[PDB]
Symmetry: C2
Subunit: 206 residues, 2 copies
């Protein structure tokens, strides 16, 4: 289907652990973690500390299996700005117990996502500037130039472990200033000169 609405039909979401200040740590979100603009961030009932993580997402334009770094950028279709919503308290316990990160990282609406930005609009994804506000006040700022692992290497690396389909996305890590959000909070985020997006923290209607 069309990359401009890739969150509607894309199957997989792969997320790098730390990529800002030896190999990347990888974890997954289900497709239902996607919350496109106009849809709320949903707070799980089991957390009392949900954090925002501002991240550049790389959307795969064709099927990508064990590709070398230099070819990796041919498999990219575009990009989207994401929040890797994280139940931080659950994560701390998972690290402690050797448990999978699912409840901390992989719940419904745990990946809010901007409009699709075609790769023609971004000649270099390592020269972008990211930002995020909670209730109008600046909280996360990062430059993608300060990423530890480059996007070509991240694509190559995960493609050698997990084949990526067209429409799959890779979240490439968060810069500094990660912190909490509560019910009714509003998160505004963007890439300077390219895209912006608004989201509202909300409880489920169960």
């Amino acid at each position: 289907r069309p990359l401009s609405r890739f969150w509607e039909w894309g199957k997989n979401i792969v997320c790098v652990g730390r990529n800002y200040a030896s190999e990347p740590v990888l974890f997954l979100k289900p497709s239902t973690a996607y919350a496109p603009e106009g849809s709320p961030i949903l707070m799980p009932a089991y957390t009392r500390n949900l954090h925002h993580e501002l991240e550049l997402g790389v959307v795969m334009g064709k099927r990508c299996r064990a590709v070398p770094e230099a070819a990796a950028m041919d498999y990219v279709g575009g990009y989207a700005l994401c929040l890797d919503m994280t139940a931080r308290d659950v994560q701390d316990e998972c690290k402690k117990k050797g448990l999978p990160w699912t409840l901390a990282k992989s719940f419904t609406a745990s990946c809010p996502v901007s409009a699709f930005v075609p790769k023609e609009k971004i000649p270099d994804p390592h020269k972008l500037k990211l930002w995020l506000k909670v209730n109008g006040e600046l909280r996360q700022e990062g430059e993608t130039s300060s990423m530890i692992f480059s996007i070509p290497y991240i694509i190559s690396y995960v493609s050698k472990i997990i084949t990526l389909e067209e429409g799959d996305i890779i979240l490439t890590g968060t810069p500094k200033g990660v912190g909490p959000v509560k019910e009714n909070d509003e998160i505004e985020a963007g890439i300077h000169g390219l895209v912006s997006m608004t989201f509202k923290v909300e409880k489920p209607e169960y």
Copy 2:
């Protein structure tokens, strides 16, 4: 438009697996859609493991968008079933557990969820009265009865659905009985549900 559940592995977006469910709440982790290996495709061995285990599991293919459903309604959201193998780099898993890292390299690599033909819901009135088996070069290594599952199926559905909305075509593997063990290049795994379905897989290294 709509694709058949008989080919759910072709279009299904998500795989959710339960940890220990045989002899307080389930452990959950995920595989990517590209973990699927339908019959005819090889179990691929990741180059970084020296201890790839099999795990015989009943899968549960969802038939209807399933968002935070109660246990008593859960079975209405099921489309059918498939027998799967939760292929696991156990050596990588131990290290993941130790460092408190994600289980991805252990449980979510390519071809790490071999899958049988789809069994419609009508053919299985009670999914807890099934018998599963698995052979490795002819030797019976896994034997389970789904009645001895700790968490029932309707609960597992009601539970994961509260955390993760499940689509049409998504599957939940409901854990593996005893008899888990390793495999190696050129081994031929066969496994089935008694009277319902059977499958065969060759273990290979990738043509990377």
